[PDB]
Design a protein around this motif. Structure first.
Motif, mmCIF file in Angstrom:
data_model
loop_
_atom_site.group_PDB
_atom_site.id
_atom_site.type_symbol
_atom_site.label_atom_id
_atom_site.label_comp_id
_atom_site.label_asym_id
_atom_site.label_seq_id
_atom_site.Cartn_x
_atom_site.Cartn_y
_atom_site.Cartn_z
ATOM 1 N N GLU A 1 -8.668 -1.011 14.695
ATOM 2 C CA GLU A 1 -7.534 -0.198 14.352
ATOM 3 C C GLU A 1 -7.005 -0.549 12.957
ATOM 4 O OE1 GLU A 1 -3.461 1.583 16.183
ATOM 5 O OE2 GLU A 1 -3.736 -0.552 16.296
ATOM 6 N N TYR A 2 -6.964 -1.843 12.652
ATOM 7 C CA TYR A 2 -6.542 -2.294 11.350
ATOM 8 C C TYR A 2 -7.513 -1.732 10.304
ATOM 9 C CZ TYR A 2 -6.272 -5.129 7.125
ATOM 10 O OH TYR A 2 -6.236 -5.548 5.855
ATOM 11 N N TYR A 3 -8.784 -2.009 10.503
ATOM 12 C CA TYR A 3 -9.808 -1.610 9.567
ATOM 13 C C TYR A 3 -9.934 -0.141 9.305
ATOM 14 C CZ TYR A 3 -11.199 -6.307 8.942
ATOM 15 O OH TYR A 3 -11.184 -7.568 8.553
ATOM 16 N N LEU A 4 -9.750 0.658 10.324
ATOM 17 C CA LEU A 4 -9.941 2.072 10.171
ATOM 18 C C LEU A 4 -8.713 2.937 10.070
ATOM 19 C CD1 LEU A 4 -12.884 2.408 12.631
ATOM 20 C CD2 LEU A 4 -13.046 2.444 10.171
ATOM 21 N N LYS A 5 -7.567 2.406 10.484
ATOM 22 C CA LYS A 5 -6.322 3.148 10.501
ATOM 23 C C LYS A 5 -5.143 2.664 9.650
ATOM 24 C CE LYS A 5 -7.513 5.057 14.878
ATOM 25 N NZ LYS A 5 -7.132 5.456 16.249
ATOM 26 N N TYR A 6 -5.101 1.395 9.275
ATOM 27 C CA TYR A 6 -4.010 0.924 8.421
ATOM 28 C C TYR A 6 -4.461 -0.167 7.457
ATOM 29 C CZ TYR A 6 -3.047 -2.449 12.187
ATOM 30 O OH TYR A 6 -3.141 -3.417 13.124
ATOM 31 N N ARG A 7 -5.672 -0.007 6.961
ATOM 32 C CA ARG A 7 -6.298 -0.963 6.095
ATOM 33 C C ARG A 7 -5.577 -1.091 4.764
ATOM 34 N NH1 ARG A 7 -8.538 -4.896 3.778
ATOM 35 N NH2 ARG A 7 -10.697 -4.787 3.161
ATOM 36 N N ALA A 8 -5.119 -2.282 4.461
ATOM 37 C CA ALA A 8 -4.380 -2.578 3.238
ATOM 38 C C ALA A 8 -4.052 -4.086 3.148
ATOM 39 C CB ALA A 8 -3.082 -1.806 3.218
ATOM 40 N N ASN A 9 -3.732 -4.566 1.953
ATOM 41 C CA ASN A 9 -3.326 -5.932 1.783
ATOM 42 C C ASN A 9 -1.826 -6.028 2.183
ATOM 43 O OD1 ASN A 9 -3.278 -8.688 1.056
ATOM 44 N ND2 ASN A 9 -4.827 -8.272 -0.444
ATOM 45 N N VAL A 10 -1.355 -7.236 2.400
ATOM 46 C CA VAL A 10 0.000 -7.408 2.845
ATOM 47 C C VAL A 10 0.918 -7.676 1.665
ATOM 48 C CG1 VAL A 10 -0.642 -7.977 5.167
ATOM 49 C CG2 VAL A 10 -0.505 -9.767 3.480
#
Lengths: 402, 400
Positions: A43-52
């Motif tokens: 889900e992180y990788y495909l839906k909200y991928r970004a640096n913090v």
């Protein structure tokens, strides 16, 4: 993160496809990973991928939020505060960071005390420090089962600067009396460091109950998380003492060509882009564990150990670690007389039973017992008594096969 | 390489491209589905620890982990045993400084650029403070161009030189080949921060004259977070003191001592990020199918149109005006508007960009500015996106 009603181990096995293919008894090396944890990472990788680091944009806002949430979830799991949780790659990095970050506090002749059964990761960093700085590295006395002599622990710990011990041995499965050792260290004014790599996710791990000043664990083991994520707990009282070993991006308040300004914990200790996917996965694992319940996990594993050890006694196959199963975790190390452990493990593999063989990164254990290595079956809540019975059937055919 | 349309066939693998215009690639790249698939395959189908365990799962995981290391080595022209896995570039750089600390003596000199990202600056500053060394910086201009004459002067007598391949704040591509030749002529150790070049252009250790080089999987290589690389040239294998030791780094141990194993395991303490290495290898394979050539060309197009488009709008932009020295990073400012505000407005239009100092405060202080808005690309970004961006920037600037 509350427990749910479920059938153990059936309901856990349903989420882990490999359980349908092999009998996986190598949990000490690494756990199998449930589908919900993989889905959380995906889900992180495909839906909200970004640096913090709170990038203005929506994706970084969501990744930052989930990263922070994950750190809170880990904090809560071990009874710590948010700011006292630092993410590392594994337990080994966490322990090395402790030694590097505290190195400056030692004077020649100071004393460090550990156990003789430590995994290499909780030995080597202290050996290097002792050698470099001229310190005394002492070992609490114990027997061949892994039972420490607490009277000797009291003597040894008195006047120690730092005490480092494992919660559970990865080679023997002994569960040390950490709460007592921690009490002795704190009563004597020593810094107390706990290697929880084999306890976390398998039984209660609480920093306050353990009197831990530093504590390390690995996501990929008990917590049913991904690889590449570990945790280092740093008690707030050491924020003015512990020197961050790794510095750079994300750790500062200000920088110029002439110097730089370090920020506050926990960011002060996390150099560069963290393993954002891994922290999320770990949080997911922890949530998954919480649903099951550490009491259910402990109880299932004890049933598996009880039947395994009793089976091995019926076969005259020697096993290591404590006979009192109250002090024996989900790890059964053993040997078949006349056979090298690697050969035993190979036979087990032919039967689709996955075990580990060798020294298990614990050469001083092997040397103390006068053996070259062991075969090791290690469990998790998803293992079943049916699997133990298949295992014992195979060991029976092996043994009779002479 | 495989026959494919750029950027359309890359976009088909990245669902987020259907939701946003992602111009924050220098922070981290978007991740294609086949990279996630490779990692899922590890987790669900051959989940195990490595180190050649007897069991089949460990045999497979170990094979794939070794395969991943070979893929990384070949991506940068190195040998297998010279590739060490870390969590990120920052860890890599810190490890260099910690691992080489013992070779320095008071008064030795380290040289770097004034444009370094904090991760390639702070470890050197700390080392210089602890050991009493001279830390000097090569002169250069506001665009990021280094003064190669000054580089020659400063690198002479230097024990160690550290430079970034590409600036994350300015987008300048330094003359790393030339700097490395100088370093090696002068007998200095050459360290390269390739975090921003890997996966966007060729990175070859032999061509760069690198003794150490670092990069991050989550940036240009289109890999996952939590995996970095530290290349250590074989010549330094017995010189580099492993900063982290423990499980997996030994040949023998006893209560009274230890002996380390051979590289690369000597430098990798504890269970590695197996999943992350497999993912990074998947990303490198994906990049290779596209081809670095096609990547660099697609990016040059986006930068060219972007910089031309901003010129039209009278929006200043930073870094080299000579585009052959300008990577897929365009930093800018809208006069009379703080960069966070520009980023927020852009975010409203589903365009993702970063604002602020970009972990490069010395760049900002040298230029006399607070920060910048930064658009950065990868091969999946399109000219249509750049036009949409320019459209939003025009409306914005028009709000005179």
């Amino acid at each position: 993160g509350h427990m749910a009603s479920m059938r153990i181990p059936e309901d856990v096995r349903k989420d882990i496809p490999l359980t349908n293919e092999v009998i996986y008894f190598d949990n000490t090396a690494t756990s199998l990973t449930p589908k919900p944890v993989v889905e959380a990472m995906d889900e992180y990788y495909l839906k909200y991928r970004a640096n913090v680091h709170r990038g203005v944009h929506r994706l970084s806002q969501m990744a930052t939020h989930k990263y922070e949430e994950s750190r809170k979830i880990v904090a809560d799991f071990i009874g710590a505060k948010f700011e006292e949780i630092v993410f590392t790659k594994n337990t080994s990095e966490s322990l090395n960071l402790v030694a590097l970050g505290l190195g400056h506090i030692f004077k020649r002749g100071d004393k460090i005390v550990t156990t003789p059964y430590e995994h290499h990761s909780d030995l080597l960093p202290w050996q290097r420090l002792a050698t470099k700085l001229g310190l005394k590295l002492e070992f609490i006395e114990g027997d061949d089962e892994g039972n420490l002599d607490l009277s000797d622990a009291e003597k040894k710990i008195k006047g120690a600067k730092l005490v480092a011990v494992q919660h559970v041995s990865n080679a023997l499965g002994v569960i040390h009396e950490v709460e007592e050792l921690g009490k002795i260290a704190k009563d004597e004014g020593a810094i107390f460091v706990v290697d929880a790599a084999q306890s976390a996710g398998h039984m209660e791990v609480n920093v306050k109950k353990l009197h831990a000043d530093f504590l390390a664990f690995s996501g990929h083991k008990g917590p049913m998380g991904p690889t590449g994520i570990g945790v280092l707990y740093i008690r707030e009282e050491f924020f003015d003492t512990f020197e961050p070993p790794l510095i750079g991006g994300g750790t500062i308040e200000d920088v110029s060509l002439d110097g730089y300004k370090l920020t506050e914990p926990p960011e002060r200790f996390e150099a560069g882009t963290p393993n954002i996917g891994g922290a999320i996965g770990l949080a997911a694992g922890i949530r998954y564990i919480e649903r099951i319940g550490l009491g259910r996990i402990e109880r299932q594993e004890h049933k598996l150990v009880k039947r395994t050890t009793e089976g091995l006694d019926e076969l005259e196959v020697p096993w290591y670690g404590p006979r009192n199963l109250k002090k024996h975790a989900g790890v059964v190390s053993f040997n078949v007389p006349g056979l090298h452990p690697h050969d035993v493990a190979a036979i087990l593999d032919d039967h689709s039973i996955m075990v580990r063989s060798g020294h298990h990164c614990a050469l001083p254990v092997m040397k103390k017992l006068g053996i070259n290595g062991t075969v090791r079956a290690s469990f998790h809540v998803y293992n079943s008594l049916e699997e133990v019975e298949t295992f014992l059937g195979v060991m029976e055919e092996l043994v009779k096969g002479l």
